Amino acid sequence: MELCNILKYDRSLYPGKAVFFYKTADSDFVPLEADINKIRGPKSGFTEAFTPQFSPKNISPQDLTHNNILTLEECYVPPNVEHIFCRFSLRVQANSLVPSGCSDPEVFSLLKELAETFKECGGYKELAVRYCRNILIGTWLWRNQNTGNTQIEIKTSKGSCYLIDNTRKLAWESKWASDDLKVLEELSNEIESALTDPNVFWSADITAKIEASFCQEIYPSQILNDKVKQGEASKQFVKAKCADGRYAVSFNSVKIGAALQSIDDWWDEDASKRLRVHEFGADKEIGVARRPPDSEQNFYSIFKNTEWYLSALKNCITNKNEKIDPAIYYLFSVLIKGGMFQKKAE
Amino acid sequence: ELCNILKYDRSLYPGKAVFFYKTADSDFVPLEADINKIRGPKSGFTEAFTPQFSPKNISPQDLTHNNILTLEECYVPPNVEHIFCRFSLRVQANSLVPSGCSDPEVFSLLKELAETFKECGGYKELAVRYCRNILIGTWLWRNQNTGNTQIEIKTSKGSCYLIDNTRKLAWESKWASDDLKVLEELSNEIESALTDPNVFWSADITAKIEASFCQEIYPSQILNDKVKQGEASKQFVKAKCADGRYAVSFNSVKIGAALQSIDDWWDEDASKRLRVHEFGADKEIGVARRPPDSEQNFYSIFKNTEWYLSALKNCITNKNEKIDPAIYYLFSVLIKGGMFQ
Amino acid sequence: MHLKELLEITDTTERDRSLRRAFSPYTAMIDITGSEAVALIILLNLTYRKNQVDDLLDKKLAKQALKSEDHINKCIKEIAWFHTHNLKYPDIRVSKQNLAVEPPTLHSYVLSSANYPKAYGWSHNSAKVNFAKLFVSYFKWQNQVSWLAQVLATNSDNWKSAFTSLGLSVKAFKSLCVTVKNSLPEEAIPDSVDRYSRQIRMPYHDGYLAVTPVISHVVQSKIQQAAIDKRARFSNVEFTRPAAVSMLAASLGGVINVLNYPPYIRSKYHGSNSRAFKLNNGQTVFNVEALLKPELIKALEGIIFSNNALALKQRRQQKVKNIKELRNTLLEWFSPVFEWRLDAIENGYDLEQLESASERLEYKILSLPDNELPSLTIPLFRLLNEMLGGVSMTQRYAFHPKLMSPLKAALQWLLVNLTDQKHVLIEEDDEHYRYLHLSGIRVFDAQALSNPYCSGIPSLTAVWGMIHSYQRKLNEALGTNVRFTSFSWFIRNYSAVAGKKLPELSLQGAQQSRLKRPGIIDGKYCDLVFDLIIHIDGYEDDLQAVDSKPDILKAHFPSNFAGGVMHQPELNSNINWCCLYSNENQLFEKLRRLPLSGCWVMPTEHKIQDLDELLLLLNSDSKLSPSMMGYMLLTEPMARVGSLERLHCYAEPAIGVVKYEAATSVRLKGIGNYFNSAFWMLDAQEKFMLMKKV
DNA sequence: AACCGCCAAAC
DNA sequence: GGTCACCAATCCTGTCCCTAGTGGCCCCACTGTGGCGGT
Secondary structure, eight states: OOOOSOEEEOOSEEEOOOEEEEOOSSOSOEEOOOEEEEEEEEOOSSTTTBOTTSOBOOOOTTSTTOEEEEEEEEOBOOTTOOEEEEEEEEEEOOOSSSOSEESOHHHHHHHHHHHHHHHHTTHHHHHHHHHHHHHHHTGGGTTSTTSSOEEEEEEETTSOEEEESOSSSOOSSSOOOHHHHHHHHHHHHHHHHHHHOSSOOEEEEEEEEEEOOTTOBOOOOBOOOSSOOSSSOSBOBOEEEOSSSOEEEBOOHHHHHHHHTOOBOOSSTTOOOOBOOOSSOEETTTTEESSOTTSSOSHHHHHTTHHHHHHHHHTTTTTSSSOOOHHHHHHHHHHHHOEEOOOOOO | OOOSSEEEOOSEEEOOEEEEEOOSSOSOEEOOOEEEEEEEEOOSSTTTBOTTSOBOOOOTTSSSSEEEEEEEEOBOOTTOOEEEEEEEEEEOOOSSSOSBOSOHHHHHHHHHHHHHHHHTTHHHHHHHHHHHHHHTTGGGTTSTTSSOEEEEEEETTSOEEEESOGGGOOSSSOOOHHHHHHHHHHHHHHHHHHHOTTOOOEEEEEEEEEOOTTOBOOOOBOBOSSOOSSSOSBOBOEEEOSSSOEEEEEOHHHHHHHHTOOBOOSSTTOOSOBOOOTTOEETTTTEESSOTTSSSSHHHHGGGHHHHHHHHHHHHHHOSOOOOHHHHHHHHHHHHOEEEO | OBSTTSTTOSOHHHHHHHHHHHTSTTSOOOBOSSOSHHHHHHHHHTTSOTTTOSOTTOSHHHHHHHHOTTTHHHHHHTTTTEESEETTSSOTTSOSOOBOOOOOOOOSSSBSGGGSOOOOEEOSOGGGTTTTHHHHOEEEETTEEEEHHHHHHSOOHHHHHHHHTTTOOHHHHHHHHHHHHHTSOOOOOOSBOOTTSOOEEEEETTEEEEEEEOEEHHHHHHHHHHHHTTOSOEEEEEOSSGGGTOHHHHHTTTEEEEEEOOOOOOOSOOOOOOHHHHSSSSOSSOSSOOOOOOHHHHHHHHSOSSOHHHHHHHHHHHHHHHHHHHHHHHHHHHHHHHHHHHHHSSOSSSHHHHHHSTTSOOTTTOOOOOOHHHHHOTHHHHHHHHTTSSSSOSSSSSOOOTTHHHHHHHHHHHHHSSSOOOOOOOSSOOOOOEEEEEEEEEEEEEESBSSSSEESSOOHHHHHHHHHHHHHHHHHHHOOOOEEEEEEEEEEEEEEEOSBOOOOOEEEOSSSOEEEOOOOOOOOEEEEEEEEEEEEESOHHHHHHHHTOHHHHHHTOOSEETTEEEEOOOTTSOOOOEEEESSHHHHHHHHTTSOTTOEEEEEOOOOOSSHHHHHHHHHHOTTEEEEEEEEEEOSOOBOOBTOSSSSEEEEEEEEEEEEEEEHHHHHHHOHHHHHHHSOEEEEEOSSEEEEEEO
């Protein structure tokens, strides 16, 4: 097909905001607060001592023993606090069935037919399992993940209560216990229903409980300061302002969303790595695009061949032994992610 | 005919809809927006491709780089149970006679058409549609049915209407008896306000939404095509409180656009309800559902008032037959108001 | 000052930048009396693009343009589109119209284009924006403001040499001279009113007149050149494509400056005699201490035209207002203290710091009651001893009059309080009058730009028009004939609203009219909460016909204000928002219970002869604001196609001054002062319609 | 001839 | 049955330091919002 002047999708997954707190005998919510610490840092960089041609600079013998004055925000667990709690809410809507905006009615009707054919093949089941699996193993804790024995407790709006006793036992590829697979099975069915039924209103309350070590360091979201003054801190944290007047140290909604949608390992047949769902499959560690524009694996190349993929999906239910093309699984992960997939008027 | 520079004031006057929450101390704490700086991926078509769909000559790690985005965000504070969205609505009778006209012939015609449309009970149907848009919480736009929403309506007359849960209602679904009684009563009050110039009618409308933990709020976004490098590329419409604090809010025209999403007469089997427009402009598709070349647009229908007068003067006596949907669309546009040449 | 005073710079970039700034209408006019040839080269090189010209003193590409009679033809095509008033501001959809008229009648209290000599701007078509610069650019000849067409119209012999210095012919030059003199801007009035021109209804002889307000190029250009010099408080209005608007807008990159003087109402903290000493007519030391006098005694003895006693009374009339102002200044801080002590019954700003401040809320100034404190006065007499140390430190103590000033302050005490004044008024009539008090009115997104010069409060003509619409509806509803003669306006809350307004899709005009979005016009918008007091006249039959129908009075209250949406106070406020009053004491007893942070919008009687006097007068007093007063008519009322009424007229918005007086100042100044010097009326005359006092 | 083109820069 | 006693007092003498230093990398968005004369 042809890409329209307007072609929008609203995202399906809505993580609220993950707030770090702890509990006393008095209060069931005491917010974990950051404080500005001024520490002494050395001159350890390449450019401090060397030219771009790998020749030593003309510096005094005492210049490399001098320090940089660092103004950093620190977050530690208070002494003799046993457990730390990270809590966020997740709402799931059915926004991948119909584009939010579309200029061409032939493109609109085609994308509506593709979603309905993908729905009856049970394609949303496989995608819901991968989103659910990221919640149970605690991918969304990022650098706090498996720093202690973590218990994840999930309360859905249906009235279901799910419990993972220890996330250290679980992994993505490892063989799970009977009770842990039952939690993955039941919660995936509730997400699939929310992804596919516009009449269904579904939300979950997800809480991690981590066995804290003595005065352990917390790793929340950092704000993007490109330019910094000498007074203010070079490293600052994302904060949720509480109703009284206190700032709980927090994760961004987009940070939590990036963890849940770390499901893309279709880019190679023997791919070990799971990427955050991107149009070009950007690998931030290796610094390469795993779905380059030159390749047919990038989103815009797959999206223009959607007529050919709709043909293969209609031969899927007639057998239901042959699996769905991984290009189609990747396709619907981008529509669930949402975005603006617009070319222009030539 | 042309009508020679005709002019109508709008009938519906909504105010700014202000988002807030209540503590055990105060009954009004304004919901404030914070500026956050986040990474964005280079994921657009133009980042990687020429307008002929050919790969651009870029570096191997240009698509792994980020855009630095400065955006405004509004979240519910932690352990706050309910979000409150409140606005005021005034209704005046500006649809009966044109406020500005030249020819007394068309003035006499339109006044006669207005009062014969009133006598057949067309204003009741339009009032029902406007009232139904108020009761299901269309005016919450993207905050609609994100939690169990309770809508309270207080009137200047002294009435007090309550919808318990807006998730149980739709446009096409069959309601409970009490919710239909609320619809009937408030429709009668709005119709009375639309049809009689000698009554004052105001309403304070409040939505109470059961908030999820640190849930995102979706207020009105400002129009800015000359944003500076220091400012946020996405900002929100604010209302200053009694103190020097800004509550995040909806525009009056945003609420107005939601209340007047009643037009589904443009097709024989139209599922979508358009915002009342002279050419039936659809924001999602970006086409006109009543195009200028067709007979379905306002300026084509407005020339046949003399025939619609005859139809209504038969409809008033023959007791049962439904009014031509063109006349419903005609009066919906007259309630919207504007200048017609 | 002179042309080649700026040509002394060896760096061509700095030279040409200064020359392009010099010949732009947002700067002062340079003298070209000595330099005519070089002036013609740069003026004719300005006709090109910026990226087409490296240096403006290149002689050859000037001769390339001058020799080419496809280039000069375009420059003389653009003379017919020279306006005194820009019809394309701010909406550029006003299609192919030009308004060139003489300035209107000169008025003492308002500012318009009458206060300056007749200058021209250009506005036709963005494509030809450079081609106008040759014949519309203003310079200083001998000692006279002039542009090229006007100076070549008559005095050609002075410019013959300058034009023939490049190698232009005499035949071509004289044919160019006669065609330019024949193609001079005539008295251009449009034959029809445009669809996008704004029309309003003003009250004419025995009916209404359709008035189109158009900005003047001169007053705008003066405000722009005043804003670049950084002389007053200004805010910005940006345009998308400024060349389509005008040349003045094109020269400034579309960033037009407007006078930003909004009301400042704060809910928060109170932090001395401070308010007096700050008001500085007043006190501490000087402007104008000390009298020490001799000054006052000499003034009285000069005024002794007509008998020593009768003179002292005539001196007093001005000198008592001046002596009253001294007491009013002194009372400004006594007002603040009292104020606090009410709100509180607790506090000042700082209870101890107040008690410490020589002239603050003392438990001795606490009372006795206001009423009994004024009846006592005593406090006022004591404060005269304190005014041996502050309220004029040392000098001018027994000196011409200090006793008379002390007596005036002791009299003011009686006036400063309570349960006193009361009755007897020629206004309105009496047979009786009425006072309609509208309280706690909330408005969302009203136009802060009163006229396209000034930003701050909405227009007073907007408040008048709303009140007139309310009158018309009430008189047509009840079948009565009451008149809403005057109003007083008290602002409780004010806040500026950010962002522009997105226009909806409509058939936008071209060769083929297409359904699309119009151009986004930048504006200024405010949310404000206010009270109105309207003064109703008529027969008691009609008044008691009005008073008998409270629901029908409430019903016809308009919901529109200056483009914004206007609502009554919230249903849980428990505020009766539409009250009628027969007597003035009951109304003033209601009105002195207003919030103290709010501001009365008060009419002044200051005279202004040009912008610089207004700016000096604004730099003088911090509580004055330039605002819209009304319309100075340019053309004669006549039948025009597209008019709302029978007769149509083009008018100019007139700039006046208002005062943001505190609630306390109006409370202490007395009932008589409030009912005489707070009420606005529309003085509707033959050639002007202006808001004024009485 | 209906539709691509011309045109600006303040702090 | 009701109030919270008056009369005066706020100390003088000397000083706030020295050394050294506030990092590298990459990036800051795509959509739309024009009047007017002419070939």
